Amino acid sequence: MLLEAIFHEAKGSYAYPISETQLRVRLRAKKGDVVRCEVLYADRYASPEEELAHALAGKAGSDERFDYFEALLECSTKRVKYVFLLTGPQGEAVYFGETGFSAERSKAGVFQYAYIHRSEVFTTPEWAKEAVIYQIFPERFANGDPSNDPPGTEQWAKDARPRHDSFYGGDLKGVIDRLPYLEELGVTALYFTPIFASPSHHKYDTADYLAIDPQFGDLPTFRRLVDEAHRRGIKIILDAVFNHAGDQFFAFRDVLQKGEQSRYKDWFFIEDFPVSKTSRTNYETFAVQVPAMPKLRTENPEVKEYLFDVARFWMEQGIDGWRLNVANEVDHAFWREFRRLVKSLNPDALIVGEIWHDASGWLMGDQFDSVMNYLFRESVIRFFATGEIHAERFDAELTRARMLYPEQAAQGLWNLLDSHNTERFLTSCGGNEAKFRLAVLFQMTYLGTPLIYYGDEIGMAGATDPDCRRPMIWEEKEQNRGLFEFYKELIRLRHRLASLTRGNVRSWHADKQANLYAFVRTVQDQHVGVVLNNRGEKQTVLLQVPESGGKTWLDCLTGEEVHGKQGQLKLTLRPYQGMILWNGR
Numbered sequence: 233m234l235l236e237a238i239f240h241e242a243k244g245s246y247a248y249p250i251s252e253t254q255l256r257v258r259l260r261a262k263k264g265d266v267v268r269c270e271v272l273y274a275d276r277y278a279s280p281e282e283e284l285a286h287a288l289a290g291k292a293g294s295d296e297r298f299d300y301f302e303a304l305l306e307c308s309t310k311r312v313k314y315v316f317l318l319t320g321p322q323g324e325a326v327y328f329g330e331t332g333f334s335a336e337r338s339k340a341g342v343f344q345y346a347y348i349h350r351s352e353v354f355t356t357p358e359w360a361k362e363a364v365i366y367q368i369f370p371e372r373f374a375n376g377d378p379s380n381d382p383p384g385t386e387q388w389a390k391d392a393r394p395r396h397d398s399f400y401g402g403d404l405k406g407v408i409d410r411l412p413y414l415e416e417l418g419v420t421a422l423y424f425t426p427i428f429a430s431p432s433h434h435k436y437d438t439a440d441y442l443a444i445d446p447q448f449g450d451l452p453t454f455r456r457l458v459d460e461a462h463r464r465g466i467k468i469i470l471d472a473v474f475n476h477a478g479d480q481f482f483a484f485r486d487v488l489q490k491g492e493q494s495r496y497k498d499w500f501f502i503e504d505f506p507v508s509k510t511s512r513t514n515y516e517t518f519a520v521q522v523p524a525m526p527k528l529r530t531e532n533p534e535v536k537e538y539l540f541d542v543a544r545f546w547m548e549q550g551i552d553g554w555r556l557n558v559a560n561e562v563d564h565a566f567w568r569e570f571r572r573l574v575k576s577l578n579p580d581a582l583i584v585g586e587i588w589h590d591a592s593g594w595l596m597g598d599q600f601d602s603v604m605n606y607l608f609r610e611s612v613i614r615f616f617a618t619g620e621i622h623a624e625r626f627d628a629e630l631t632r633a634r635m636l637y638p639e640q641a642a643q644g645l646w647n648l649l650d651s652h653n654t655e656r657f658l659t660s661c662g663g664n665e666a667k668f669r670l671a672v673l674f675q676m677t678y679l680g681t682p683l684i685y686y687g688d689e690i691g692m693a694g695a696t697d698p699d700c701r702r703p704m705i706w707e708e709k710e711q712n713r714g715l716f717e718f719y720k721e722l723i724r725l726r727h728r729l730a731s732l733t734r735g736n737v738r739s740w741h742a743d744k745q746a747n748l749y750a751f752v753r754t755v756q757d758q759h760v761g762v763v764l765n766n767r768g769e770k771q772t773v774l775l776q777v778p779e780s781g782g783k784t785w786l787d788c789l790t791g792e793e794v795h796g797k798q799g800q801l802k803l804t805l806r807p808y809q810g811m812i813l814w815n816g817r
C-alpha cells in the first residue's frame with residue numbers, strides 16, 4: 233500500500249464526536265490500496281497492559297482517487313487514544329498512528345482525542361434535520377398589496393424580461409396570501425432574500441437593518457407573516473447581510489457628512505477623506521468598486537454589538553434562522569459570538585452560511601450549522617442538465633463532497649439547483665422537462681436539505697441575473713401543474729420516509745456506459761434505494777442486493793412490487809425514469 237496516500241488527523245472532518253461518549257474517526261487512502269481498516273483504542277490514561285478495544289471501519293464511500301473508511305469509537309471515559317490497523321489487497325499489514333507507520337503497533341504511536349466536552353458536540357436544529365426550504369425573492373414572488381408598489385412597476389406577466397433596475401411590486405402581503413399554496417406544496421420553511429429597506433430591487437445595499445422595506449411592508453405585516461406561516465407549520469429564515477452595508481445606512485451617511493469628525497469613520501474601511509462619489513470609491517467595498525456597498529468593520533466592537541442588536545430585534549419577531557450573505561468575509565470571532573447569541577435566544581434558530589469554497593473552517597460546530605451546497609449544484613448541473621459528466625464521475629463528485637465535513641453539517645447542506653444568482657435549472661436543461669424531473673427526483677431523495685427556488689415547481693425558466701428573477705406565474709392554466717403534483721409527491725415521500733431525512737448515503741451502482749446511477753439511504757432497518765436511468769433510452773440493469781437487507785422492494789412512485797432473485801434485482805426504466813424503491817422496513 234502506498235503509505236504516502238493514507239490520511240487522518242485527530243480533528244476536523246476525520247475525528248469528531250457525535251456524542252459525549254462517541255467519537256467518529258475517518259481515514260483516507262488511495263482507492264483500492266487498502267482492503268480492511270480496524271481501530272484499536274482505549275482510554276488515554278489506560279495502562280500499557282490493558283486490552284485495547286476494537287472497532288471495524290467500514291468503507292464509507294469512494295472518491296475518484298480515495299477510499300474513505302469510517303469507525304465509531306465508544307469512549308465512556310470521554311478521552312481516547314487510538315491506532316489504525318490497515319490490511320492490504322493480498323495480506324500486508326501496518327499500524328497507523330501519530331508517530332507514523334510500523335509493522336509493529338507500538339512503534340506507530342497513537343492518535344489522541346484529548347477530551348469530549350458536551351458543549352463541543354456539533355448540535356443542530358432538529359426541525360432543520362428534515363426540512364424542505366422554499367426560496368423567495370419577495371420583489372418577484374407576489375404583489376399582495378399594489379398600494380406600496382414602487383414607481384415604474386412593470387406588468388406581471390409570463391413574458392416579463394427584467395433589467396438590473398426593474399421592479400414588479402412583489403411584497404410581504406403577497407407571500408401571506410400565498411401560504412395556502414406553499415402549505416399545499418409541503419415546504420416547511422421559507423428563505424427570503426433581503427427584505428430590509430434599501431433603494432435597490434434586490435436589497436443587498438441595506439439602508440436600515442431595523443425596518444422592513446416600505447415596498448414590501450411594515451413590521452406589523454411581517455409579524456403577521458411569521459404568525460400565519462408558523463400555524464401553517466412553515467418557519468421563516470432571513471438573509472443576514474453583515475459584511476457590507478448600503479451607502480444609505482445611517483452610519484455611512486454620517487461619514488459622508490461629518491467627514492473626519494464622524495463618530496463612525498472606524499465602522500468602515502476609509503482610505504482617505506472626504507468619502508467618495510461614483511465607482512471610484514475610496515473606502516473598501518464588497519467585491520470591486522461597488523459604491524453602494526461599503527464594507528462593515530465587524531472587527532470593530534461597536535459594529536458587532538450593533539449588528540447583534542439588529543439580530544436581537546428580528547429574532548424578537550420570531551424568525552427561525554439566518555442565511556449569512558458573504559459569510560466568509562467577516563471574522564470568525566464574530567460568527568462564534570453570533571452563534572452563542574443566537575443559540576441563547578432561540579436554540580432552534582438555524583444558521584446557514586453562504587461560502588463558495590471549502591467551508592470546513594466554519595463547520596466545526598461553533599459557528600454555522602450548514603452552508604449552501606454549491607457542489608451538489610455543480611454535480612447536478614453537469615450530470616442532468618449539460619450532460620458534461622457521467623454516472624461515475626457523478627458518483628465521485630457526490631462522494632468527494634460528502635466527505636468534506638462532519639456528518640452533522642453534511643446532513644444539513646442546502647441542496648439547491650439554482651438561485652437568484654443563476655439561470656434557472658430548467659433553462660440549464662435546454663428546456664427538457666424529462667431531465668429536469670430526474671434531477672428533482674434526485675434532489676428530493678438525496679442526503680441534505682432540499683432547496684426549492686420559487687417558480688421551478690411550476691416550470692418557470694430564465695437566464696442569469698436578472699432573467700432568473702422574473703415574476704412568479706400564478707394563472708393556473710399557465711403553470712405546469714403536472715410538475716407541481718410531481719414535487720408534491722416527492723416532498724410527501726421525503727416527509728414519510730425516515731431514511732430520506734435522517735439516513736445516510738451509499739453508492740449502489742454506477743455504469744458510465746448506461747449512464748445509470750443508484751444509491752441507497754439507510755436508517756435503522758429502513759432501506760430506500762433510488763435508481764436513476766439518466767439516459768434517453770429504456771434500459772435494464774441488475775443490481776446487487778443480498779437477501780439480508782430484504783429481498784422484496786416496492787417502488788414508491790408506482791406501487792410496483794419488485795423481487796430479488798438470488799441477490800440480484802432486474803429493473804427496466806423508461807427514458808430518464810427514476811425509481812424510489814422501499815424495503816418496507
Ligand SMILES: OC[C@H]1O[C@@H]2O[C@H]3[C@H](O)[C@@H](O)[C@@H](O[C@H]4[C@H](O)[C@@H](O)[C@@H](O[C@H]5[C@H](O)[C@@H](O)[C@@H](O[C@H]6[C@H](O)[C@@H](O)[C@@H](O[C@H]7[C@H](O)[C@@H](O)[C@@H](O[C@H]1[C@H](O)[C@H]2O)O[C@@H]7CO)O[C@@H]6CO)O[C@@H]5CO)O[C@@H]4CO)O[C@@H]3CO
Pocket residue numbers: 396434436518519520522557558559586587588652653697
Ligand atoms: O451589486 C452587487 C450584487 O449585489 C447582489 O449580489 C449578492 C448575491 O445575490 C448574493 O448571493 C451574494 O453573492 C456573492 C457571494 O456571496 C460571494 O462569495 C461572491 O461569490 C462569487 C460569485 O458567485 C461569482 O459569480 C463572482 O462574482 C462576480 C460575478 O460573476 C460578475 O458577474 C459580477 O457580478 C455583477 C452582477 O452581474 C450584477 O448583477 C450585480 O450583482 C448584484 C446582484 O444582483 C445582487 O443580488 O453586480 C455584480 C458586480 O458586483 O461581479 C462579481 C464580483 O466581481 O465571483 C464571486 C467571488 O469571486 O460574489 C457573489 C456576488 O457576485 O452576495 C452578493 C452581494 O451581497
Ligand SMILES: [Ca+2]
Pocket residue numbers: 375376377378379380381382401402403447
Ligand atoms: Ca406591492
